[PDB]
Amino acid sequence: NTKPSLLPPPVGNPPPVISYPFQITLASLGTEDAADSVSIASNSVLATYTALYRHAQLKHLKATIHPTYMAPKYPTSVALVWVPANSTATSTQVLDTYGGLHFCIGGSVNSVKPIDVEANLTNLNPIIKASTTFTDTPKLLYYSKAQATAPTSPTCYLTIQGQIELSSPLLQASS
Amino acid sequence: MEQDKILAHQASLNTKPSLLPPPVGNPPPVISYPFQITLASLGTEDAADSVSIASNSVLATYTALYRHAQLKHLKATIHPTYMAPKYPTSVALVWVPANSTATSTQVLDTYGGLHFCIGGSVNSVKPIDVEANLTNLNPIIKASTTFTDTPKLLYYSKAQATAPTSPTCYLTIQGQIELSSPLLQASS
Amino acid sequence: NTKPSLLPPPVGNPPPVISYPFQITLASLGTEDAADSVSIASNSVLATYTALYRHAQLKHLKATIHPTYMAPKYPTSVALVWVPANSTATSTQVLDTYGGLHFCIGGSVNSVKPIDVEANLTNLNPIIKASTTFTDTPKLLYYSKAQATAPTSPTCYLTIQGQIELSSPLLQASS
């Protein structure tokens, strides 16, 4: 036979698309070691925006590290990398992953400027909501090592920001 | 005029998403099969349900032999019976994608939800058709890929307090389904 | 002087617009007399959709009366009219207002078909959210009289349905 599945042809005008922006704080770092993996498509916050639609696609997406007033005196290490969600790499293997970055935040000259790390949406699947579920959407891995004698306030914040294109309203009730 | 941001670049490579390659090997033969299924006998007691077309037991007896199944046409129909004139019955229904969170008791709170009064002497006992829009809802109820937006019908019905013993109307769905790609099953 | 206020010229591309549909049940009628006035722009449900944007305009809007299984035996009167929100007319003066309609639902032949009453958006201000507040947005007035010996279940439902065009995201927090 050989008839898996594609879509029927778009009937008329394609549905209108709107972009909604967002910025989310994933973590406050520097007071203790930290390591997590964040699957963007499963994020609680983004889900509230996509709940009303059938199609949601990331337009731009990036992670930013913002050093705070405690970074100068308490150098902190932050490593991170973007991988498709089906990758099995863990937060402790960032430097063993192609493209993995490790930064030294604070202590030395010029080391308090914020850092941007864009996610390459041509290397990661940007569709986080559609007629079917995808397995290769963006996942961010991050690892952080803090000073043994740590501060009581974070040395930096890790956020992600971007824009999602939303389209095709998903019928829901008003109640 | 320096900027206050450092840009770090994560090395890229040539890696892309993918689905199913093209047919170019002889597009499979497609057959169209008709059906009419009675979903419910209403009017003897209140009733409410949600019917996911892709999960329906009866329709599945036809699609079980194939790997691909796509609706060509689909509609719900309410057929008043000999008990409708004396026992007016309420029937409300709406068609939504299967991933909608709407429930059978919220038909009138959903865009497009309809509520009808079936029976009543003064009324009409003409049957009513409500077509499913297959350009909004995804018509592919069976494929290599699982889709989440296939047709789901929500319905609610309220019966007279002092109800009849035979139904006042029947709710059925009817259409034609395009089938292709035999799926090996046993014959025992 | 004589310099009240207009807007500065649209700089570049106009912002994208999306339409979101809705249907809301305003009332279950026929079990007792009822009378209310509904200011659309102040509606709780619609507010949840417009909360994320700066501009919201009604595209289509109508009221529908849906007779139920109790209408045949319990004729009910329903009167309604659409007026700008700054009108001081009350629900009991529908027939004393230009365009006011009064319907008899149930009891007689052909009287169980649902009824649509579209709101004229060229006679009412469709902008329910913008840079300033408007005073002439849609307001629906409705009145209903029930049988003295009323049923325990409603004889009809009053709903409103339409679509709102939303645009220009309003910056909000993710928290």
Add this chain to the structure above:
Amino acid sequence: MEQDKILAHQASLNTKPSLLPPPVGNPPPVISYPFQITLASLGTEDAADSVSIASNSVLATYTALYRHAQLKHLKATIHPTYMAPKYPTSVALVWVPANSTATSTQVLDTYGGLHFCIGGSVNSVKPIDVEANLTNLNPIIKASTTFTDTPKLLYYSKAQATAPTSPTCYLTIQGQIELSSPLLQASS
């Protein structure tokens, strides 16, 4: 093939919404006035506030004499002082329309929110400018009509536990405002 709906028509008439008619009577003379206002002295204790430009007491002393006031340019600036090198201070800020529900403690959870580390030996004590985008935010802070989307600045600052007695930096806003249409006030 009859439909199951009755359409009722509400009689219409010629009635439309309206605002302000055109100027054509001699467009009023507009003057541009410059300003620089210190909003806060930071670094001696934690601080957080929300400043609605249209409600600011100081800026209002200039706009009180006119009926129309529109920002031509506007920016916030952080100026490190002689105490910044030894007492690093955190300052976060973002510009939002006045009708935004975001609060000063949610700067980093708002699209565009910035957080800076001021001071620190290794650091730089160069002043920082953050321009307000007057094409996103409504620049008309005073008019015949009241607008809800004028510029609002949100800021948060965290100081060292063992803080200095003099501020580590000053936060100010600066720009030019176009004024027109004298508004009669008393001179006493």
Add this chain to the structure above:
RNA sequence: UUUUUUU
């Protein structure tokens, strides 16, 4: 419906 708005 108590239909004369959308030039």
Add this chain to the structure above:
RNA sequence: UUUUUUU
């Protein structure tokens, strides 16, 4: 820098 003056 708290850069929109020098047409």
Add this chain to the structure above:
RNA sequence: UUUUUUU
């Protein structure tokens, strides 16, 4: 950065 994807 541990930069060779966007033809």
Add this chain to the structure above:
RNA sequence: UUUUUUU
């Protein structure tokens, strides 16, 4: 009606 056959 539970209307998509008669090219």
